[PDB]
Amino acid sequence: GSHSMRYFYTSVSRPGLGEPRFIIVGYVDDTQFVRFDSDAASPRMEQRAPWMGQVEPEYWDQQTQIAKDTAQTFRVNLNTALRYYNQSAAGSHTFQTMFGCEVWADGRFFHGYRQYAYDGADYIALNEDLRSWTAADTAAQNTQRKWEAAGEAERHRAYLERECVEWLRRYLEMGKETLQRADPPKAHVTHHPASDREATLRCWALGFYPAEISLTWQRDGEDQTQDTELVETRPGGDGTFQKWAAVVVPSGEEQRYTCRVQHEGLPEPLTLTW
């Protein structure tokens, strides 16, 4: 499929208890590769993916400094948002941003984004043209005027179109042995008496990467979409993902039902029965 590099910043104030907490996490596709956590006596940008050993030795020091400077401006944004929204100094509040770029499998850029949130709600976002801002309310409109006057969209667009894709391309190369080899799911079906006349068929898919997957129940080859229960995809803990799909069937009718598993790592869809 396509590829993306995604970063997420979170800033949380704590009145009475000192300085705000600041977390960065970065992802290539469904793999976390760095983190920064200000909760430490000397916080560092740190690797979270083994193929990050291949960076230049000055990388960690450089990224640690940029991270500390970013924390400082998010500390100031938490106080600024208090003034825009006319809130007291008493309560804890949250400021978040997320941004990233996307790339076709051949490495070509096609999408970049940048958004900001305050207390869990849209605050301001870069528009699809990467040349203008959308403010979510009148408080955020202060930030819209300020950032238009100072030409911030261009600097944001420059980063998302050049540096972001350039480095997404390098990281994919660094971790090709793992980021570009899909791990197919291991699928099985289980049987558990639901009612006196009915049974639950559960179709399990474990140990797959990346996270995108199709798990559907068919009865006599037709889609059973209304009557399936389907859990949100969840992490295995080892960098793999899991999902399952269930359906309730009349007893003895099991053979009517089939489970289809489409995943990037499967040459052809798996088809399973009880």
Binding site: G26, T70, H156
Partner: peptide, 9 residues
């Protein structure tokens, strides 16, 4: 890789 954009709101 991150850069510093000084994102003061």
């Amino acid at each position: 890789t991150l850069i510093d954009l000084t994102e003061l709101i």
